[PDB]
Amino acid sequence: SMTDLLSAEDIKKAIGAFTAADSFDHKKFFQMVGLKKKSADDVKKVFHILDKDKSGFIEEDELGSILKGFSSDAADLSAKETKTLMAAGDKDGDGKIGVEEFSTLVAES
Ligand SMILES: [Ca+2]
Ligand SMILES: [Ca+2]
């Protein structure tokens, strides 16, 4: 239910903004998609959509498919881009992103 939280306009814009020349940058992404302006509560609702298996964490598979949370046709991040985002978000080093870490990722964006 991402379009309950973010607009199709912003989602298109956010995904359409990166060329191959651009490093996928979650900071730019979360800004352009509209997530930085959402309440903390809506950021957590975004988190739970991303947490596809509802394990309470965004694990590395789910993280590589992050963009699919916003637009299901979007491609996965590459291994490298996925691990870059995991390095940014995974502050306790357990190899997955919890609720706090996800909010932090958005806050740092
Ligand atoms: Ca999960
Ligand atoms: Ca973690």
Short mmCIF file of all heavy atoms in Angstrom, two decimals, residues 34-87:
data_model
loop_
_atom_site.label_atom_id
_atom_site.label_comp_id
_atom_site.label_asym_id
_atom_site.label_seq_id
_atom_site.Cartn_x
_atom_site.Cartn_y
_atom_site.Cartn_z
N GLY A 34 9.57 11.86 -1.36
CA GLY A 34 8.65 12.51 -0.39
C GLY A 34 8.74 11.99 1.05
O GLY A 34 8.05 12.47 1.93
N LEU A 35 9.60 11.00 1.29
CA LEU A 35 9.63 10.32 2.58
C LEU A 35 10.19 11.17 3.73
O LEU A 35 9.83 10.97 4.90
CB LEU A 35 10.46 9.04 2.48
CG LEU A 35 10.27 7.92 3.53
CD1 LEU A 35 8.78 7.63 3.86
CD2 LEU A 35 10.99 6.64 3.06
N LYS A 36 11.07 12.12 3.41
CA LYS A 36 11.65 12.97 4.45
C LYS A 36 10.61 13.87 5.12
O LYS A 36 10.77 14.24 6.29
CB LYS A 36 12.84 13.79 3.92
CG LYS A 36 14.13 12.94 3.73
CD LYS A 36 15.22 13.70 2.96
CE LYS A 36 15.79 14.89 3.75
NZ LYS A 36 17.02 15.53 3.10
N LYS A 37 9.54 14.20 4.41
CA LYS A 37 8.52 15.11 4.95
C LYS A 37 7.41 14.38 5.69
O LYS A 37 6.55 15.01 6.30
CB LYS A 37 7.92 15.99 3.85
CG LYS A 37 8.94 16.79 3.06
CD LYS A 37 10.12 17.33 3.93
CE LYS A 37 11.33 17.88 3.09
NZ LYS A 37 12.00 16.92 2.08
N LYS A 38 7.42 13.06 5.65
CA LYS A 38 6.37 12.28 6.30
C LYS A 38 6.60 12.22 7.80
O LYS A 38 7.75 12.35 8.28
CB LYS A 38 6.31 10.85 5.73
CG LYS A 38 6.12 10.78 4.22
CD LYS A 38 4.76 11.28 3.75
CE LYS A 38 3.65 10.31 4.20
NZ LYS A 38 2.29 10.75 3.73
N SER A 39 5.52 12.01 8.54
CA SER A 39 5.66 11.74 9.95
C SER A 39 6.46 10.46 10.17
O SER A 39 6.61 9.58 9.27
CB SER A 39 4.32 11.64 10.66
OG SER A 39 3.65 10.52 10.20
N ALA A 40 6.95 10.36 11.39
CA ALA A 40 7.73 9.22 11.82
C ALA A 40 6.87 7.98 11.74
O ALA A 40 7.37 6.90 11.43
CB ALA A 40 8.24 9.43 13.26
N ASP A 41 5.58 8.14 12.05
CA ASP A 41 4.62 7.05 11.96
C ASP A 41 4.48 6.54 10.50
O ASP A 41 4.52 5.33 10.24
CB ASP A 41 3.27 7.53 12.49
CG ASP A 41 2.27 6.39 12.63
OD1 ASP A 41 2.49 5.49 13.46
OD2 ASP A 41 1.22 6.31 11.97
N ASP A 42 4.28 7.45 9.54
CA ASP A 42 4.28 7.05 8.12
C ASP A 42 5.60 6.44 7.62
O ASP A 42 5.58 5.57 6.77
CB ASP A 42 3.91 8.23 7.24
CG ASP A 42 2.45 8.56 7.31
OD1 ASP A 42 1.65 7.74 7.84
OD2 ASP A 42 2.03 9.64 6.86
N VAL A 43 6.75 6.90 8.13
CA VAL A 43 8.02 6.27 7.78
C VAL A 43 8.02 4.79 8.21
O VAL A 43 8.46 3.91 7.48
CB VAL A 43 9.27 7.05 8.34
CG1 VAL A 43 10.56 6.32 8.01
CG2 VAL A 43 9.35 8.46 7.71
N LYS A 44 7.50 4.53 9.40
CA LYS A 44 7.38 3.14 9.90
C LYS A 44 6.37 2.32 9.09
O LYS A 44 6.57 1.14 8.90
CB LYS A 44 7.04 3.11 11.39
CG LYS A 44 8.09 3.81 12.25
CD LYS A 44 7.69 3.82 13.72
CE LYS A 44 8.70 4.61 14.58
NZ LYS A 44 8.28 4.52 15.98
N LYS A 45 5.31 2.95 8.58
CA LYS A 45 4.40 2.23 7.68
C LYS A 45 5.10 1.92 6.38
O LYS A 45 4.89 0.84 5.81
CB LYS A 45 3.06 2.99 7.46
CG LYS A 45 2.35 3.14 8.79
CD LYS A 45 0.95 3.64 8.77
CE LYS A 45 0.29 3.28 10.14
NZ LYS A 45 1.22 3.31 11.32
N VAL A 46 5.97 2.83 5.91
CA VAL A 46 6.76 2.54 4.73
C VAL A 46 7.70 1.37 5.02
O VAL A 46 7.82 0.44 4.22
CB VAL A 46 7.59 3.75 4.19
CG1 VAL A 46 8.64 3.24 3.16
CG2 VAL A 46 6.71 4.76 3.51
N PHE A 47 8.36 1.42 6.18
CA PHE A 47 9.22 0.32 6.63
C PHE A 47 8.50 -1.04 6.54
O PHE A 47 9.03 -2.00 5.98
CB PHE A 47 9.73 0.56 8.06
CG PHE A 47 10.47 -0.63 8.63
CD1 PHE A 47 11.85 -0.75 8.44
CD2 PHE A 47 9.77 -1.68 9.24
CE1 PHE A 47 12.55 -1.87 8.95
CE2 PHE A 47 10.44 -2.80 9.74
CZ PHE A 47 11.82 -2.90 9.60
N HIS A 48 7.29 -1.14 7.09
CA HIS A 48 6.58 -2.43 7.11
C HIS A 48 6.19 -2.96 5.72
O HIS A 48 6.21 -4.16 5.51
CB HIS A 48 5.43 -2.40 8.13
CG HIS A 48 5.89 -2.12 9.53
ND1 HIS A 48 6.77 -2.95 10.20
CD2 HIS A 48 5.61 -1.11 10.38
CE1 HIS A 48 7.01 -2.46 11.41
NE2 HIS A 48 6.32 -1.34 11.53
N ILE A 49 5.90 -2.07 4.77
CA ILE A 49 5.68 -2.45 3.36
C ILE A 49 6.97 -3.07 2.79
O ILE A 49 6.94 -4.15 2.21
CB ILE A 49 5.20 -1.23 2.54
CG1 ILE A 49 3.86 -0.74 3.10
CG2 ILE A 49 5.13 -1.53 1.02
CD1 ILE A 49 3.44 0.65 2.63
N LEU A 50 8.10 -2.42 3.02
CA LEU A 50 9.42 -2.89 2.59
C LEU A 50 9.83 -4.23 3.19
O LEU A 50 10.58 -5.00 2.59
CB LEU A 50 10.48 -1.83 2.90
CG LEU A 50 10.26 -0.46 2.20
CD1 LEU A 50 11.48 0.46 2.44
CD2 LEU A 50 9.98 -0.63 0.71
N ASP A 51 9.37 -4.46 4.41
CA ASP A 51 9.65 -5.67 5.16
C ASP A 51 8.63 -6.70 4.68
O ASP A 51 7.62 -6.98 5.33
CB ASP A 51 9.51 -5.39 6.67
CG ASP A 51 9.63 -6.62 7.51
OD1 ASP A 51 10.13 -7.67 7.01
OD2 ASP A 51 9.25 -6.63 8.69
N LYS A 52 8.91 -7.23 3.50
CA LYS A 52 7.96 -8.04 2.77
C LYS A 52 7.54 -9.30 3.54
O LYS A 52 6.37 -9.69 3.51
CB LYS A 52 8.51 -8.36 1.39
CG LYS A 52 8.63 -7.13 0.49
CD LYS A 52 8.67 -7.53 -0.99
CE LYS A 52 9.97 -8.27 -1.35
NZ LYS A 52 10.03 -8.56 -2.82
N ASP A 53 8.47 -9.91 4.27
CA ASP A 53 8.16 -11.15 4.95
C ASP A 53 7.75 -10.89 6.39
O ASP A 53 7.54 -11.83 7.18
CB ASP A 53 9.30 -12.17 4.84
CG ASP A 53 10.58 -11.74 5.57
OD1 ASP A 53 10.64 -10.70 6.26
OD2 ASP A 53 11.61 -12.42 5.50
N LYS A 54 7.64 -9.60 6.72
CA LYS A 54 7.28 -9.14 8.04
C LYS A 54 8.11 -9.78 9.16
O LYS A 54 7.56 -10.17 10.19
CB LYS A 54 5.77 -9.38 8.27
CG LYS A 54 4.91 -8.61 7.29
CD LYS A 54 5.05 -7.11 7.54
CE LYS A 54 4.18 -6.34 6.55
NZ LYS A 54 4.81 -6.46 5.16
N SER A 55 9.42 -9.90 8.96
CA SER A 55 10.31 -10.46 9.96
C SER A 55 10.68 -9.41 11.01
O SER A 55 11.36 -9.72 11.99
CB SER A 55 11.59 -10.93 9.32
OG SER A 55 12.27 -9.80 8.81
N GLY A 56 10.25 -8.16 10.77
CA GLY A 56 10.63 -7.04 11.61
C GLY A 56 11.91 -6.35 11.18
O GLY A 56 12.30 -5.35 11.77
N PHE A 57 12.57 -6.87 10.15
CA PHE A 57 13.79 -6.27 9.60
C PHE A 57 13.70 -6.27 8.09
O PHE A 57 13.02 -7.12 7.51
CB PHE A 57 15.02 -7.07 10.00
CG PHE A 57 15.16 -7.25 11.46
CD1 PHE A 57 14.67 -8.41 12.08
CD2 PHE A 57 15.79 -6.28 12.23
CE1 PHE A 57 14.78 -8.61 13.46
CE2 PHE A 57 15.89 -6.44 13.61
CZ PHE A 57 15.39 -7.63 14.22
N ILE A 58 14.37 -5.30 7.47
CA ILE A 58 14.60 -5.37 6.03
C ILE A 58 15.94 -6.07 5.87
O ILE A 58 17.00 -5.52 6.11
CB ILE A 58 14.61 -3.97 5.32
CG1 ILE A 58 13.29 -3.20 5.56
CG2 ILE A 58 14.89 -4.13 3.79
CD1 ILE A 58 13.34 -1.70 5.28
N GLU A 59 15.87 -7.30 5.43
CA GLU A 59 17.05 -8.08 5.20
C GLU A 59 17.59 -7.72 3.83
O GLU A 59 16.97 -6.93 3.10
CB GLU A 59 16.73 -9.58 5.37
CG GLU A 59 16.41 -9.94 6.83
CD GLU A 59 14.94 -9.93 7.19
OE1 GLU A 59 14.06 -9.85 6.29
OE2 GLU A 59 14.64 -10.02 8.41
N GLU A 60 18.76 -8.27 3.49
CA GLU A 60 19.45 -7.92 2.26
C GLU A 60 18.68 -8.19 0.96
O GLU A 60 18.76 -7.41 0.01
CB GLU A 60 20.82 -8.61 2.22
CG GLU A 60 21.67 -8.10 1.07
CD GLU A 60 23.05 -8.70 1.07
OE1 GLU A 60 23.44 -9.26 2.12
OE2 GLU A 60 23.75 -8.61 0.06
N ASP A 61 17.93 -9.28 0.91
CA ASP A 61 17.06 -9.49 -0.26
C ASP A 61 16.01 -8.37 -0.40
O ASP A 61 15.92 -7.70 -1.43
CB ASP A 61 16.42 -10.89 -0.29
CG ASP A 61 15.67 -11.24 0.96
OD1 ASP A 61 15.77 -10.56 2.00
OD2 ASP A 61 14.93 -12.24 0.98
N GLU A 62 15.27 -8.14 0.67
CA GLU A 62 14.27 -7.12 0.68
C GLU A 62 14.85 -5.75 0.42
O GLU A 62 14.22 -4.94 -0.25
CB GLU A 62 13.58 -7.13 2.03
CG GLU A 62 12.78 -8.38 2.28
CD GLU A 62 12.30 -8.45 3.70
OE1 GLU A 62 12.78 -7.66 4.53
OE2 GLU A 62 11.45 -9.29 4.00
N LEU A 63 16.05 -5.49 0.91
CA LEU A 63 16.71 -4.22 0.67
C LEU A 63 17.06 -3.99 -0.83
O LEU A 63 16.87 -2.87 -1.37
CB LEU A 63 17.91 -4.09 1.57
CG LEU A 63 18.51 -2.70 1.58
CD1 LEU A 63 17.58 -1.65 2.25
CD2 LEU A 63 19.84 -2.81 2.28
N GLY A 64 17.58 -5.03 -1.48
CA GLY A 64 17.88 -4.97 -2.92
C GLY A 64 16.63 -4.77 -3.74
O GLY A 64 16.66 -4.16 -4.80
N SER A 65 15.51 -5.27 -3.24
CA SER A 65 14.21 -5.02 -3.87
C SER A 65 13.51 -3.78 -3.32
O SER A 65 12.31 -3.62 -3.53
CB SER A 65 13.28 -6.25 -3.77
OG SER A 65 13.90 -7.37 -4.37
N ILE A 66 14.24 -2.89 -2.64
CA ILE A 66 13.56 -1.72 -2.00
C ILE A 66 12.70 -0.92 -2.99
O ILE A 66 11.56 -0.51 -2.69
CB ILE A 66 14.59 -0.81 -1.25
CG1 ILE A 66 13.87 0.28 -0.44
CG2 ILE A 66 15.65 -0.21 -2.22
CD1 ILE A 66 14.79 1.07 0.54
N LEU A 67 13.22 -0.70 -4.18
CA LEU A 67 12.54 0.16 -5.12
C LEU A 67 11.23 -0.46 -5.58
O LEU A 67 10.31 0.29 -5.94
CB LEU A 67 13.46 0.50 -6.31
CG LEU A 67 14.70 1.34 -6.01
CD1 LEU A 67 15.47 1.60 -7.31
CD2 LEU A 67 14.38 2.67 -5.31
N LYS A 68 11.16 -1.79 -5.55
CA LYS A 68 9.94 -2.54 -5.86
C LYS A 68 8.84 -2.24 -4.85
O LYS A 68 7.66 -2.31 -5.18
CB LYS A 68 10.19 -4.04 -5.98
CG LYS A 68 11.28 -4.41 -6.99
CD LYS A 68 11.33 -5.90 -7.28
CE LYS A 68 12.29 -6.18 -8.44
NZ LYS A 68 12.05 -7.48 -9.08
N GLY A 69 9.22 -1.88 -3.62
CA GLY A 69 8.24 -1.41 -2.64
C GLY A 69 7.49 -0.18 -3.09
O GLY A 69 6.31 0.02 -2.75
N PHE A 70 8.18 0.67 -3.85
CA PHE A 70 7.62 1.94 -4.29
C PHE A 70 6.98 1.76 -5.64
O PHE A 70 5.93 2.31 -5.91
CB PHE A 70 8.70 3.04 -4.30
CG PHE A 70 9.29 3.30 -2.93
CD1 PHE A 70 10.33 2.51 -2.45
CD2 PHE A 70 8.76 4.27 -2.09
CE1 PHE A 70 10.87 2.73 -1.21
CE2 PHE A 70 9.30 4.48 -0.83
CZ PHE A 70 10.34 3.70 -0.39
N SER A 71 7.59 0.93 -6.49
CA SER A 71 7.00 0.65 -7.80
C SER A 71 7.38 -0.77 -8.23
O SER A 71 8.54 -1.05 -8.47
CB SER A 71 7.44 1.72 -8.80
OG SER A 71 7.19 1.30 -10.10
N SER A 72 6.41 -1.67 -8.28
CA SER A 72 6.71 -3.11 -8.33
C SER A 72 7.53 -3.55 -9.54
O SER A 72 8.28 -4.50 -9.47
CB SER A 72 5.44 -3.94 -8.23
OG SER A 72 4.64 -3.60 -9.33
N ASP A 73 7.37 -2.83 -10.65
CA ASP A 73 8.16 -3.07 -11.85
C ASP A 73 9.65 -2.62 -11.72
O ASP A 73 10.47 -3.00 -12.54
CB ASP A 73 7.52 -2.27 -12.97
CG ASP A 73 7.51 -0.77 -12.65
OD1 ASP A 73 6.54 -0.31 -11.97
OD2 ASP A 73 8.47 -0.02 -12.95
N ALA A 74 9.98 -1.79 -10.73
CA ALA A 74 11.36 -1.28 -10.60
C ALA A 74 12.37 -2.45 -10.45
O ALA A 74 12.04 -3.50 -9.93
CB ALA A 74 11.48 -0.32 -9.44
N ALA A 75 13.58 -2.28 -10.95
CA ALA A 75 14.54 -3.37 -10.90
C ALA A 75 15.16 -3.37 -9.52
O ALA A 75 15.12 -2.37 -8.81
CB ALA A 75 15.64 -3.16 -11.98
N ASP A 76 15.73 -4.50 -9.15
CA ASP A 76 16.50 -4.61 -7.94
C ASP A 76 17.74 -3.74 -8.05
O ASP A 76 18.25 -3.46 -9.15
CB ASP A 76 16.98 -6.04 -7.76
CG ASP A 76 15.96 -6.93 -7.11
OD1 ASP A 76 14.80 -6.53 -6.84
OD2 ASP A 76 16.27 -8.09 -6.83
N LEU A 77 18.24 -3.34 -6.89
CA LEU A 77 19.52 -2.70 -6.81
C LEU A 77 20.49 -3.79 -7.16
O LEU A 77 20.17 -4.98 -7.02
CB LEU A 77 19.76 -2.13 -5.39
CG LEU A 77 18.78 -1.04 -4.96
CD1 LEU A 77 19.13 -0.55 -3.55
CD2 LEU A 77 18.77 0.11 -5.97
N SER A 78 21.65 -3.41 -7.66
CA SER A 78 22.72 -4.37 -7.86
C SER A 78 23.23 -4.85 -6.52
O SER A 78 22.93 -4.24 -5.47
CB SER A 78 23.87 -3.74 -8.63
OG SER A 78 24.47 -2.74 -7.83
N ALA A 79 23.99 -5.94 -6.54
CA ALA A 79 24.63 -6.41 -5.32
C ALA A 79 25.36 -5.26 -4.63
O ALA A 79 25.16 -4.99 -3.43
CB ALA A 79 25.59 -7.62 -5.60
N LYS A 80 26.19 -4.56 -5.39
CA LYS A 80 26.95 -3.47 -4.84
C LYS A 80 26.06 -2.35 -4.26
O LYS A 80 26.32 -1.86 -3.18
CB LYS A 80 27.92 -2.91 -5.89
CG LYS A 80 28.86 -1.85 -5.31
CD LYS A 80 29.76 -1.28 -6.39
CE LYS A 80 30.58 -0.12 -5.85
NZ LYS A 80 31.94 -0.13 -6.46
N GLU A 81 25.03 -1.94 -4.99
CA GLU A 81 24.17 -0.86 -4.52
C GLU A 81 23.44 -1.28 -3.25
O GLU A 81 23.28 -0.49 -2.34
CB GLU A 81 23.15 -0.52 -5.57
CG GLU A 81 23.71 0.21 -6.76
CD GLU A 81 22.70 0.31 -7.90
OE1 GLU A 81 21.90 -0.64 -8.14
OE2 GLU A 81 22.69 1.35 -8.55
N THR A 82 22.97 -2.53 -3.23
CA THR A 82 22.35 -3.15 -2.06
C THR A 82 23.28 -3.12 -0.87
O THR A 82 22.87 -2.72 0.23
CB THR A 82 21.98 -4.62 -2.37
OG1 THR A 82 21.13 -4.66 -3.53
CG2 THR A 82 21.15 -5.26 -1.23
N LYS A 83 24.50 -3.61 -1.04
CA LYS A 83 25.46 -3.59 0.07
C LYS A 83 25.84 -2.13 0.50
O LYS A 83 26.15 -1.87 1.67
CB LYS A 83 26.73 -4.39 -0.26
CG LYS A 83 26.52 -5.85 -0.59
CD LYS A 83 27.87 -6.60 -0.51
CE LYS A 83 28.52 -6.58 0.92
NZ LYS A 83 28.09 -7.62 1.98
N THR A 84 25.85 -1.19 -0.43
CA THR A 84 26.08 0.23 -0.08
C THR A 84 24.96 0.75 0.82
O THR A 84 25.20 1.46 1.78
CB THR A 84 26.17 1.10 -1.32
OG1 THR A 84 27.34 0.73 -2.09
CG2 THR A 84 26.36 2.56 -0.93
N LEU A 85 23.73 0.37 0.51
CA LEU A 85 22.60 0.84 1.28
C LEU A 85 22.58 0.16 2.63
O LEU A 85 22.35 0.83 3.62
CB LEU A 85 21.31 0.68 0.49
CG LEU A 85 19.99 1.19 1.06
CD1 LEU A 85 20.07 2.65 1.45
CD2 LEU A 85 18.84 0.91 0.08
N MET A 86 22.88 -1.14 2.67
CA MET A 86 23.05 -1.89 3.93
C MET A 86 24.16 -1.29 4.82
O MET A 86 23.98 -1.14 6.03
CB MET A 86 23.35 -3.37 3.63
CG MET A 86 23.28 -4.27 4.85
SD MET A 86 21.63 -4.22 5.62
CE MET A 86 20.71 -5.42 4.66
N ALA A 87 25.31 -0.98 4.22
CA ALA A 87 26.35 -0.26 4.97
C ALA A 87 25.84 1.06 5.54
O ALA A 87 26.19 1.39 6.68
CB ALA A 87 27.63 -0.05 4.12
#
